DNA sequence: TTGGAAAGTCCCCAGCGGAAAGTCCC
DNA sequence: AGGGACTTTCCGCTGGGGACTTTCCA
């Protein structure tokens, strides 16, 4: 009798709200929920259908999953965690009212104290091993399901995790997007100056990736040409064929080195001199 | 008679106010003409007097009715929000380098203002002009009432609450007060205080040095309509215009604007617009004009930046 | 078409910074500059304005201008040298981001090998004539401009040197400064005791130079009264007029015999007994 | 019971630690009693036992919890930073001349400290007291575990990194330990080791001799406020003071300090200051006092030097 | 609720010195 | 042996500047 996530939460998109904000945040989306149809976090208990209880807890992103300072708020929640009974006659349970409320780097310690005083530590990470910096732009849901063994006495299953959730406030992980481009056609010898407006990017972890069939180049630009994270001015790289006779469509796009992530491609036409 | 006078006015814009939490020494204030090498030394001067003198500097508001500002003047020779330097017995010209404004927080605006009125009534630093009308009886008499009564604490509590419901934390003024040595030698002789131009916080969205960082094209046909990509420093979509222009023969100016809508204003830092038609679409030779940005709200402009209109 | 230095780089004042120091060294100020003015260490191209490239290199001080172990770091540099593109529609070019980054007497051989492997030898000093000790407290900027003949094909002009730059490190050359003086007034008959704190000087090559109108004397003091290279305790020579009736201002300054160098004057006022 | 006892402590200040690259033999310890005529050296004695014996000398930290020190004891009978001599079968007093202090570089502190704890746990030289509490099981048993296990290499790596974050490179102490022959004859019987007074490297600014070289005025009015220029030996602008003082009748002392700021301390070698007011501004006859230099940090002083306070 | 900011936090880079540490040498 | 001085790290403040957070308003 174990637990498995049927429907993981959406990773990026939703922004955690502070306590001083909306008495209410939002509600965590499934991961296949769309504008048309909305879904939600859903686990599946294998080898058990009957009376029990479930607790959803907030933990840290990486390995030593210490309980996160952030508070899960909404229906049936309290002390930063969610808890309610399991449908005794169903094996699948989705939670449609999960809300993340983030704490301030200031009230950090006070928050950690409440995870302790309230006994919230699903991986029993030690008081000694609890020390360290906490990533406040991400978390994981930790489902601690409690069924009953065949005898009839409560049975706490293994705590399972969900891939990490990310605050739509962390540009180190948001989605790349190109918004404008004052020029999508230059010389095949390259060197053409190009003004590109975009979405918040990080000047040290970004580059214009010109891809082609079997070809691959980058635009030339210095970290200081990344204008306030929303505009890059760079010069086109020379195409594979320097004597081009006929114009050739090429794929141009934003690339964040740290993770190989790529924005949608934007058509660019290399031309004979 | 003996008086006080400003030889050099602070620059009004281009300076950032600094919060406590940001730390110390981020830049001093400035004066006119800030030539390439940094040359401003703002210098007041005592006139029709030459001898020992005390000059104090306080932060006041930019309303119709002068008042103490909750903000603090910090740095060289400053203490309790006031800058106190002495005017040499011979040299009567005072300068004020390394002077920074300390931006108080919104939440601590009342109590900080209340404590500044207290310190100014204790030291007798212009209490009647800045805190309240009927407190002028408290003059710096080598310590004009080193101890405030319980009725004087009630005048300050009422002036504080009343002046905080309307204090522009984004603009402030300097006010110099000179004190000459009386009989005893104690500088209690007050001269008519003189206030300075206004100085606007550069971290105000409506006052950062409006600047045109780069432009993909610095020339254009006289028929205009051409599309230009321009990056810039923080600007407000709805509160900004690109203004083309040129000095005329008669002294007047040809004015033309860029065509673009608030949606064309990319993430506060750039603007895609369309050149305006030049005054004369049929010249035979190119003509140079100027192009700048410009807040509607306060009509402040960026630096005239050259543009060339050519025929077609 | 030749090259000439409109503005020479200041020779003393600026200290070469070690690789360990920061990430970048300040930038070489110009000779002209001071408190009140802007200074550019520029060059002038005579008989050519148009497409061209420029490489600023580091060469030794004395005659066999073998390339210098030290490096030229800052904008547009690499391999210890500056290089970029001349402005095509201008004939005057100043360089305001040149810094000097010395090498350790220990990593000397490895720096020399990088001049060789990167082909950095403007005066092609031979592999054989390359042997010998290098003056690490002095170097020479070596502009190597490359324009094009009236013809069209690249034309390398002649390498032009600037006077040497010295590390404000070794005190045998430093700049002379008087900091404090426990007295700037005394008897005409001289013999007055004066303490004077100053910038590092050598006791065997220093002396107090009292200059006046068509008059000239020196202060009396032992190599031993030179305290830790920072203070001089000396006595005031007697003035030309030993019967002075009224006070007379006179110039007093530090003077290094080995090169006549003199610090900025300090007003001294002789008086009558 | 059989113990160890120091006869002559090393001299606390004045000796210079030398770095590898400085060359060899540059000067012997020095004994606390040592003079330029009668030179002495550290010296210890084995009491309540007479016969062969082994005594070793290790440097240790000067903290609250004694720890091995990265520096190495070099020279006579020294190897691997350890001084080892034998206590003659009848003369139980051992001296240590020509002992030098090798000062490890900053960059080689960790790796050299790791190496020393290992050699100390292999030979069994007080591993428990100096390297780590639960390593005391490695006792010099004719070769107390001549081969360190893998778990022992880890304790070492964890003590090394933990102890290097707070090691004072300008202070060291000697630790003597004595071993007496066992049943087999192998010097394995360990006596309570004993530690010496701390030694301070004479190159360290916070430990170099303080001395007033010259002064442009050794007398002053009792009113004080008079400005004097003082030349000295390397001193730290932030950690130094000028103390004037005179023995009183009751045995106490009148204390007076020069008024000077960290900016008045010229290139670590002079100081422009102003005299303090005397304890009595109305005496009729001059009084001879004393003035000296004093580091705050450790409170050491320059040699009392004569100053004359005349009345006005 | 959702989005977009403005208001309040942080804290890097770059240019200067000044000295400590680490090297050599009279 | 004995101490000065030169060459190679380490640190700290001044001046600004961008960007990350908490709070605020439509």
Coordinates of N, CA and C (backbone and C1' of nucleotides) in Angstrom, one line a residue, chain C residues 18 20-21 104-105 137 169-170 202 228, chain F residues 3-12:
Chain C
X18 N 48.4 43.9 -9.1 CA 48.6 42.5 -9.3 C 47.3 41.7 -9.7
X20 N 46.1 39.2 -8.4 CA 45.3 39.0 -7.2 C 44.5 40.1 -6.8
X21 N 44.9 41.4 -7.1 CA 44.1 42.5 -6.8 C 42.9 42.7 -7.6
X104 N 54.5 38.4 -11.3 CA 55.4 38.2 -10.2 C 56.7 37.7 -10.7
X105 N 57.8 38.1 -10.0 CA 59.2 37.8 -10.4 C 59.3 36.3 -10.5
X137 N 59.5 47.6 -13.0 CA 58.9 48.8 -12.4 C 58.7 49.9 -13.5
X169 N 55.7 52.1 -7.1 CA 56.1 51.1 -6.1 C 57.4 51.4 -5.5
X170 N 58.5 51.3 -6.3 CA 59.8 51.6 -5.8 C 60.1 53.1 -5.5
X202 N 64.1 58.5 0.3 CA 65.3 57.8 0.7 C 66.2 58.8 1.4
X228 N 62.1 56.9 9.6 CA 61.4 55.9 8.8 C 60.9 56.3 7.4
Chain F
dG3 P 67.9 43.3 16.4 O5' 67.3 44.2 15.2 C5' 68.0 45.3 14.7 C4' 67.7 45.5 13.2 C3' 66.3 45.9 12.9 O3' 66.3 47.0 12.0 C1' 66.9 44.3 11.5
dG4 P 65.1 48.1 12.0 O5' 65.2 48.8 10.6 C5' 66.5 49.0 10.0 C4' 66.5 48.9 8.5 C3' 65.3 49.5 7.9 O3' 65.7 50.3 6.8 C1' 65.5 47.2 7.1
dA5 P 64.6 51.2 6.0 O5' 64.3 50.2 4.8 C5' 65.3 49.6 4.0 C4' 64.8 48.8 2.9 C3' 63.6 49.4 2.1 O3' 63.7 49.1 0.8 C1' 63.1 47.2 2.9
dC6 P 63.1 50.2 -0.3 O5' 62.8 49.2 -1.6 C5' 63.7 48.2 -1.8 C4' 63.0 46.9 -2.1 C3' 61.8 47.0 -3.0 O3' 61.8 46.1 -4.1 C1' 61.3 45.6 -1.2
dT7 P 60.7 46.1 -5.3 O5' 59.8 44.8 -4.9 C5' 60.5 43.5 -4.9 C4' 59.5 42.4 -4.8 C3' 58.3 42.4 -5.8 O3' 57.9 41.0 -5.9 C1' 57.4 42.8 -3.7
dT8 P 56.5 40.6 -6.7 O5' 55.6 40.3 -5.4 C5' 55.7 39.1 -4.7 C4' 54.4 38.7 -4.1 C3' 53.2 38.7 -5.1 O3' 52.3 37.6 -4.7 C1' 52.7 40.2 -3.4
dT9 P 50.7 37.7 -5.0 O5' 50.1 37.0 -3.7 C5' 48.8 37.2 -3.4 C4' 48.6 37.5 -2.0 C3' 47.1 37.6 -1.7 O3' 46.7 36.7 -0.7 C1' 48.2 39.5 -0.8
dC10 P 45.2 36.5 -0.4 O5' 44.9 37.8 0.5 C5' 45.6 38.0 1.7 C4' 44.9 39.1 2.5 C3' 43.4 39.1 2.2 O3' 42.7 39.2 3.5 C1' 44.3 41.2 1.7
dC11 P 41.1 39.5 3.5 O5' 41.0 41.1 3.6 C5' 41.6 41.6 4.8 C4' 41.0 43.0 5.0 C3' 39.5 43.1 4.7 O3' 38.8 43.8 5.8 C1' 40.8 44.6 3.3
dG12 P 37.7 44.9 5.5 O5' 38.5 46.1 4.9 C5' 39.2 47.0 5.9 C4' 38.7 48.4 5.7 C3' 37.2 48.5 5.7 O3' 36.9 49.8 6.0 C1' 37.9 48.8 3.5

